[PDB]
Each structure stands twice: as C-alpha cells, then as structure tokens.
Copies of this chain bind each other. A is one copy, B any other.
Amino acid sequence: TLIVTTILEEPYVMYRKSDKPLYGNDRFEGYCLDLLKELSNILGFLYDVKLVPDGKYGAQWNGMVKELIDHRADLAVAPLTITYVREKVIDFSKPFMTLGISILYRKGTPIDSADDLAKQTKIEYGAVRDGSTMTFFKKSKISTYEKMWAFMSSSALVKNSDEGIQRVLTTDYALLMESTSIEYVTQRNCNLTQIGGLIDSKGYGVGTPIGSPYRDKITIAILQLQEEGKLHMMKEKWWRGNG
C-alpha cells in the first residue's frame, strides 16, 4: 500500500543479477531494500518500490524530494542526506547512517590527512565540479580547507565521481567525496585507500512528506535497528569486499 521512491545506486539499490526479465520489488536488492524489509516488518506495512523518474536525489524541487512534496510517494528510502534546505520541505527520520566528506587516494604514500595534502602542491586533489563537496571547501573558514580551496580554485575539479576515481587510478590525484562511496571503492580496489577521517558530518535519513503518520514510527524503528546492531550488519553485508 505504501509507495516508496528510490534511486538506482550501488550498493543501496541494484538489479538482482540475472539474464532474464525480473518483475516486482524483488527485481531490486541492496542495502536500502534490506532496510525497507526491516521497516515494513517492524511497522507492518506493504510497499511498492518505484524509481524516481528524473533519477535525482532532490535539489531546488526535483528528484525524490519532489515526489514526497507532491505526495506521489509515501517514503523515500535511499542514501538521502539530511540537510537544512531539504528538512524545510520534507521530514527525515533520525539517521540510519552517519558519514561525511573524506579523501580517496592510492595506498603506499606518506599522506595521512587533509593537512598533508593542504601543505603541498605536487599531488593534485579536488572534487566534482559544482558539487556539495566543492561548495564545502569554497565556503569553509577553517585553515586546512581554505588552503585546499585556494589550491583547487587556482583543472583539479572533475566532471563526476567516476571520472574522479579514474583520475585517482591513472594520475597522482586525490579525490574528495562522500565517505560511504570511498568505503565501497576501497573495499573493491586494494590499490586505493581512504586518507584521514571525516572532514564534515551528515547523515542519511528516510524521507516522508511533512506531517506523515509514519514519520515517528520510522525513526523509532531505525533506533531499534541501530541498537540491535542490524544497521551495522547490513552495512557490512553490502560493503565488504574480497579483502
């Protein structure tokens, strides 16, 4: 009965491996599908997974945020960052995942933090042109990140994350991006590693239209899953690589 809007994004939402046509919600698998099953089991509801038409997360509105605003979806279950501008138009459950910006670089170097990159110019580094990561640096008033923005600002920016990862693999370049993706990539490419910890902090939350009768029910369920260790189990399940 509940319409869930989401977006194809590895390993949150992916098509089950198969060479034949797949039907229904079961054609999808991933972290967010497992989370949805857990939520539906706790709250006791049926659901219909729909892919947001424009394939966008939500900016101003479009994407999943718009689907919720227009009430075409009851929930948005995806790695949707809880932000100031979004929280004003939709509601978010408490975070089912906490993350932040971090660094993707090749293993085997003495570089161990953002500071190490900030105090040199041999190694180039940047982020996806005009993304929230680039904006973070442009607006930061913190010493380390101001220096980094000055460097980035002075060809160090990339078209998208995929190109950024290739840049890291084919040149002496460090990429700044969402940490969850960095963990996913490093678990699959032993030549790459995360440099330092989280540069900023944010979380992913399940989205609902403002005033939804499921808002608090979902937060409670998430806290239950968090405390039972199920969110940790799910993260490990979909992120762990072959070592």
A83 and B228 CA atoms in complex are apart in Å by: 12
The distance in angstroms between the C-alpha atoms of A92 and B95, with both chains bound, is 12
Given contacts A87-B219, A219-B87, A220-B87, contact A229 B140 (CB under 8 A): yes
Q: Are B219 and A142 in contact (CB under 8 A)?
A: no
In this assembly, does A203 line the interface, its C-beta being within 8 Å of a C-beta of chain B? yes
B98 touches A223 (CB 8 A): no
A82 x B98 contact (CB < 8 A): no
A54 within 8 A of B: no
CB of A20 closer than 8 Å to a CB of B: no
Number of copies: 2
| Shortest Cβ gap from A179 to chain B (Å) | 13
Contact B82 A223 (CB under 8 A): yes
The answer to whether A83 touches B223, judged by C-beta atoms less than 8 angstroms apart, is yes
List, in ascending order, chain B residues with CB within 8 A of A226's CB. 201-202
Q: What is the bound-complex CA distance between A224 and B141, given in angstroms? A: 15
Shortest Cβ distance from residue A63 to the other chain B in the assembled complex, whole angstroms: 19
Q: Is the CB of B84 within 8 A of A224?
A: yes
Closest to A235 in B: B201
CA–CA, A95 and B222, complex, Å? 14
Q: Which of B88, B92, B223, B232 contacts A200 (CB 8 A)?
A: B232
Instruction: Tell me the chain A residues, 209-243 only, with Cβ under 8 Å from chain B.
Output: 216, 219-220, 223-224, 226-227, 229, 231-232
How many whole Å from A2's CB to the nearest CB in chain B? 22
List CB contacts (< 8 Å) of A174-219 with chain B: 200-203, 216, 219
Are A84 and B232 closer than 8 Å at their CB atoms? no
- A202, B141: Cα distance in complex, Å: 28
